[PDB]
């Protein structure tokens, strides 16, 4: 009943989470319209 409680500041507690990989090498993004995806690479070796 008679409590008289006063609340002070709270805490935060977020992660130490920064990608460094969605920002350095994976800068380019594409959506899909198909089901599978190919990834072709031509071996460039002239004679």
């Amino acid at each position: 009943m008679y409590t008289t409680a006063q609340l002070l500041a709270a805490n935060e507690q977020k992660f130490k989470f920064d990608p460094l990989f969605l920002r350095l090498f994976f800068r380019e993004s594409y959506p899909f319209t198909t089901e599978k995806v190919y990834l072709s690479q031509i071996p460039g070796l002239v004679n």
Binding site: Y38, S40, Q41, I42
Partner: protein, 49 residues
């Protein structure tokens, strides 16, 4: 060099200098290659399906 001919003898006569020639004539190169007209039927690795 000059060496030392004394002032009593005529001395020897030097061959002046010079003479060297050469030839580097032919050279060639020709990379012929084919277009393969029947290669265009199938799909290239490019040109997304």
């Amino acid at each position: 060099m000059a060496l030392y001919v004394s002032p009593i003898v005529s001395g020897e006569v030097i061959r002046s200098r010079g003479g060297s020639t050469s030839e580097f004539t032919p050279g060639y190169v020709k990379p012929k290659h084919e277009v393969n007209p029947q290669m265009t039927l199938r799909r290239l690795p490019d040109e997304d399906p």
